[PDB]
Design an enzyme around this catalytic site. Structure first.
Site, PDB file in Angstrom:
ATOM      1  N   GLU A 126      -3.175   7.381  -4.169  1.00 50.85           N
ATOM      2  CA  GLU A 126      -3.251   6.116  -3.446  1.00 50.85           C
ATOM      3  C   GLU A 126      -3.032   4.972  -4.425  1.00 50.85           C
ATOM      4  O   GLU A 126      -3.761   4.850  -5.417  1.00 50.85           O
ATOM      5  CB  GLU A 126      -4.596   5.970  -2.734  1.00 50.85           C
ATOM      6  CG  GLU A 126      -4.827   4.609  -2.098  1.00 50.85           C
ATOM      7  CD  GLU A 126      -6.197   4.490  -1.447  1.00 50.85           C
ATOM      8  OE1 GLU A 126      -6.382   5.018  -0.333  1.00 50.85           O
ATOM      9  OE2 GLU A 126      -7.093   3.869  -2.054  1.00 50.85           O
ATOM     10  N   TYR A 178       0.847  -1.184   0.000  1.00 50.39           N
ATOM     11  CA  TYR A 178       0.000   0.000   0.000  1.00 50.39           C
ATOM     12  C   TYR A 178       0.885   1.237   0.000  1.00 50.39           C
ATOM     13  O   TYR A 178       1.885   1.292   0.720  1.00 50.39           O
ATOM     14  CB  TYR A 178      -0.927   0.013   1.220  1.00 50.39           C
ATOM     15  CG  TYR A 178      -1.776   1.261   1.345  1.00 50.39           C
ATOM     16  CD1 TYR A 178      -1.278   2.412   1.946  1.00 50.39           C
ATOM     17  CD2 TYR A 178      -3.078   1.287   0.863  1.00 50.39           C
ATOM     18  CE1 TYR A 178      -2.051   3.552   2.056  1.00 50.39           C
ATOM     19  CE2 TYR A 178      -3.858   2.419   0.971  1.00 50.39           C
ATOM     20  CZ  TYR A 178      -3.343   3.547   1.570  1.00 50.39           C
ATOM     21  OH  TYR A 178      -4.122   4.675   1.674  1.00 50.39           O
TER      22      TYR A 178
END
Ligand SMILES: Nc1ncnc2c1ncn2[C@@H]1O[C@H](COP(=O)(O)OP(=O)(O)O)[C@@H](O)[C@H]1O
Ligand SMILES: Nc1ncnc2c1ncn2[C@@H]1O[C@H](COP(=O)(O)OP(=O)(O)O)[C@@H](O)[C@H]1O
Ligand SMILES: [Mg+2]
Ligand SMILES: [Mg+2]
Ligand SMILES: [N+]
Ligand SMILES: [N+]
Lengths: 234, 239
Positions: free
Chosen positions: A208, A120
């Site tokens: 993101e 992530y």
């Protein structure tokens, strides 16, 4: 305002990041043609069909007419037709959508790749700190909420100088903190550099990447690659 | 008359064979664009640039102005431009061409794949036998002439019924004779069936696949794939 996956990935590619933008299709017939043409380059490869909707949780979502999944594996171009035909013009239901689901008018057709690791990575303006922050975890498979309360040693937060941007030393440390070695360290540095440039130069509120992956090429080289992308604007 | 690799591979695909037809470019700019677009699908992959000329031995050939090889590996789209720019509009010299070489007007841009095995397989009308014959070796890396005298056990010759075509039992035996097991046996059978249909239904004098490969897909599935193709025709044939 969020932009679609493929648009975000093309923007990342424009700034020198590696991202699987695949190719977008607005009809199931066109989706099948993309897959068939790709079989001329990598015969026998498999495909992934990704609904292009402004919502997360696509993989575990479901469609009214019965199909399970908004990110689906397909072994043939005809399976790409079948899957895309259930997506285009229909509503996908995920946890991030209401029970009303969300309409899908196009899909991304991608080659199926071997994923070795999932990370992530997010870039955002942290109001508490008053500066940009790079957040990343080496456990992209599990949600970021849980990670910080089931293995916090794997979550990393890097404050960035707003005027000078990230330093090479910061990015090298972040790459090694994520478990990378060899050529993958500098590969990660280059990609995060590009991700921050997207964030800074495009006046984004968030970049993101979930997941930022270590994938194998068809000849088994390990490379960093954005396999999903969400970029927001005010 | 032989036809080019690109046409032979597309013809094989039309009859259900697995062949890497890639994409043909007539300029180095287009060659680069093909490679760049392919990085959207398999990021980080490598490329192979193949001169489309009517002559064999391309890989081991050379170009007058210094480049070595008519089948060249390229790691980036810009290397594809560089390699293609030395091919298009220039002459390739090989063992099968004259000293002056042959002009190249276009290239095939292909994705680089992992090759596990290379086989030779040819289908032709054997005048001595008076029937079609399928010839194959499990040692496609070495010339078929080298095989017949240094490892003849690896060369197989299968006469074919002209009226009924190959039988499933012949093709299964040939696949196993070449060392295949598991899913690759039926994969090979289907591909050779398709190659014979090309030979028979297109009135070809020869379908030569050198190499017929076992390759890995990007997700590591082993499949049969034609990595080269040479198909011949006789314009002055017997009616
Ligand atoms: N090209 C691909 N090949 C194989 N698996 C993929 C590919 N792209 C994505 N995936 C997998 O599919 C999952 C779901 O895709 P993603 O783009 O993250 O959508 P979402 O997060 O909305 O479910 C990813 O977490 C990854 O594990
Ligand atoms: N896509 C590919 N990726 C990697 N190697 C390849 C690929 N296609 C062909 N090759 C290799 O290149 C060699 C030379 O190419 P080929 O098509 O046989 O031309 P020629 O016989 O005229 O040299 C093949 O024998 C094979 O080993
Ligand atoms: Mg995701
Ligand atoms: Mg050859
Ligand atoms: N792989
Ligand atoms: N592979």
């Amino acid at each position: 305002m969020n932009i679609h996956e493929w648009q975000s990935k093309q923007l990342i590619q424009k700034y020198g990041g590696r991202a699987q933008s695949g190719e977008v299709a607005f009809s199931p017939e066109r989706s099948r043609d993309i897959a068939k043409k790709l079989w001329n380059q990598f015969p026998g490869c498999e495909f992934v069909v990704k609904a292009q909707v402004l919502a997360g949780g696509r993989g575990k979502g479901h469609w009214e007419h019965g199909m399970q999944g908004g990110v689906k594996l397909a072994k043939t171009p005809e399976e790409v037709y079948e899957i895309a035909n259930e997506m285009i013009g229909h509503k996908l239901i995920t946890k991030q959508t209401g029970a009303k689901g969300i309409n899908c008018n196009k899909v991304m057709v991608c080659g199926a790749v071997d994923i070795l690791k999932e990370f992530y990575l997010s870039i955002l303006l942290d109001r508490a700190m008053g500066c940009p922050v790079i957040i990343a975890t080496s456990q992209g498979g599990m949600g970021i909420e849980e990670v910080a309360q089931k293995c916090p040693e794997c979550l990393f937060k890097v404050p960035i100088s707003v005027k000078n941007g990230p330093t090479n030393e910061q990015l090298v440390k972040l790459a090694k903190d994520l478990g990378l070695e060899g050529d993958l360290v500098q590969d990660c540095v280059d990609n995060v550099k590009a991700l921050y440039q997207v964030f800074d130069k495009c006046d984004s509120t968030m970049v993101e990447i979930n997941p930022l992956g270590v994938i194998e090429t068809p000849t088994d080289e390990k490379v960093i690659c954005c396999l999903d992308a969400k970029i927001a604007f005010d």
